[PDB]
Design a binder for this molecule. Structure first.
Ligand SMILES: [Zn+2]
Ligand SMILES: [Zn+2]
Lengths: 366, 370
């Protein structure tokens, strides 16, 4: 067995919630952790110092540490889902410059990520937009994983994560879980569960994945940022998260709060001279009232997006810090009960999918 | 009784009023004519000091020390804060605070004190501006109020050797009123003069006539700063009328609409005709965006990752502004400014028949024939 990068610090006795820390080359990272998308923050005027002040110790990148001037950890994806036909050789596409046919193979994806110098790297996978081609992409993703592992020639400097496939197909994801688990990679990601319509199928697929992933290795759930989703998925055994949710929420003039969000473009805030949250210690809540942000959203929209994003990212980091603390304090079920009460009002008004999911791990709201 | 001058005239056009010079400012010289981008609008879009310095920018506008807050080694210009932040009396501007929400006052003395602490190299007086919808004798009262406010700014500004206070010419589109304001403010010894009240107007014909009126009465040995002007044709014509400094949100605003500034106008990159155009925005532009991004890539980003496309379009649009005025300035030094304008109008519009009538008349007033 290779050295493990995650140390389990505490567990919830009723549910699957875990509190740990990751040992990465650029410093330790407390888990559960939400990782903001670094470039989405940089393009809105958020600097390294601001992100460091909020306590962020890891974020996602498109070496790369110097290009961003970032002293902490970075996670980079393969680049497939962004950048067309796919064969067994790799992803075929037209370059965004020379305009000629290009190939991104599993070997090339690893070589690119090796040069960037990030601390966690993601395998190249084959994602499809129904028929029997979905199972073929899953088996190709397993073969691509082995080629990534062979091409990764620095396991002591960078950590390669596999990506579980299968979408919403319980039988397909079970096959992928059984096959990828046989490889000794430092961590595992859960793909194909972002932006789904059926919340009931969403949490059942998360529970299926965490029941078969190794306990001593991190579980990274991709594309999840909604507050209730984060709390429920921590109770199911997830350790790492990423989403553009804080960035996207700010583009619509909304600020994340314990009861949902504040739609600051509404006229009811034009004369509200309080902060977004009187208990939030983020810079935006020290200098900006709701009335000011409301005024900026109608004239100087670009400046309002900067301050809303600072707060929305801060909310994410504060949420999981509170989640992690409740696990350490051996009182995570009580945290969830208080969180659902504040967010929705009463057990009768909570979304059914979250009540059933939490009950699956023995956290009752009734 | 004249203070040392901050502008040195280097060359002039023999036919028109176009001037090429340099400003001696505490954080370095600045070649004029110069377009000054709004620094905060660029910072909020991910543009860094290093990127802006590489483009050759040596002066930009600040929100309103401030040099350290931006991490900027060159010069800064800050406004008074009036147009942003309600009733106005002789004491100052009365408004409700954004923080405590209580009544606050911005006086001429307080505006200077704020700008003194920011540490910028050029500072703007506080003026009393009324909407263009106001018509009667309240417009003339605001103009005379601005002159009295100017004297209070000068008295409250106790560091003419570290910061340069500019007056702001009032009057709007009223030829008689602006003549009074020009005649009155010229008697004050300020290092430079700005021209206010000419941004975003509908009537282009009255616009260029008001610019010419201002430059005919402002001192020759002092800079002329034209506020709120960034359109390419506007910049060239106003340089020919005697203006030295410009600022606008035009490059930043143009990027919010998915458009890239080019010598023939702009490219509307959200249109489907660019989805398979794998050439740069401009093959002759040396900006970073034109080194790394094709039109097809920017077209794709404008429909999925809009925030990233705004960053790269703004880098290019700012570079276009700086390149345009650098070329303008070079043609003046080369004693070939009329020929520059003729080629510029040819590329922009196509032929004399298709040029805007207001620009043909304005250029003809200073002896530039197309
Ligand atoms: Zn906040
Ligand atoms: Zn360019």
């Amino acid at each position: 067995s290779a050295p493990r990068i995650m140390r389990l610090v505490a567990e919830c006795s009723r549910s699957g919630a875990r509190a740990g820390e990751l040992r990465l080359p650029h410093g330790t990272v407390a888990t559960p952790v939400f990782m903001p998308v670094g470039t989405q923050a940089t393009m809105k005027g958020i600097t390294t110092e601001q992100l460091d002040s909020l306590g962020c110790r890891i974020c996602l990148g498109n070496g790369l540490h110097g290009f961003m001037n970032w002293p902490h950890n970075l996670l980079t994806d393969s680049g497939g889902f962004q950048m067309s036909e796919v064969t067994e050789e790799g992803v075929h596409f037209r370059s965004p410059y020379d305009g000629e046919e290009t190939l991104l193979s599993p070997e090339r994806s690893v070589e690119i990520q090796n040069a960037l110098g990030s601390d966690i790297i993601m395998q190249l996978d084959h994602v499809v937009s129904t028929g029997p081609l979905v199972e073929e992409a899953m088996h190709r993703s397993v073969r691509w994983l082995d080629r990534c592992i062979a091409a990764h020639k620095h396991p002591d400097k960078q950590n390669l994560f596999a990506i579980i496939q299968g979408g919403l197909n319980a039988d397909l994801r079970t096959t992928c879980l059984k096959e990828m688990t046989k490889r000794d990679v430092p961590g595992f990601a859960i793909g194909g569960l972002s932006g789904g319509e059926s919340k009931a199928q969403f949490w059942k697929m998360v529970a299926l994945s965490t029941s078969m992933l190794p306990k001593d290795k991190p579980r990274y759930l991709m594309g999840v940022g909604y507050a209730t989703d984060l709390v429920v998925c921590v109770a199911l055994g997830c350790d790492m998260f990423d989403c553009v949710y804080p960035t996207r929420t700010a583009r619509f003039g909304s600020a994340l709060v314990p009861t949902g969000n504040l739609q600051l473009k509404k006229k009811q805030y034009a004369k509200d001279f309080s902060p977004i949250n009187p208990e939030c210690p983020c810079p935006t809540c020290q200098t900006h009232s709701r009335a000011f942000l409301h005024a900026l959203l109608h004239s100087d929209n670009t400046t309002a997006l900067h301050h809303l994003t600072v707060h929305n990212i801060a909310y994410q980091l504060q949420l999981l810090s509170a989640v992690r603390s409740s696990i350490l304090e051996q009182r995570f079920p009580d945290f969830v009960r208080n969180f659902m009460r504040t967010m929705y009002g009463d057990h009768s008004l909570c979304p059914a999918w979250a009540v059933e999911a939490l009950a699956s791990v023995g956290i009752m709201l009734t």
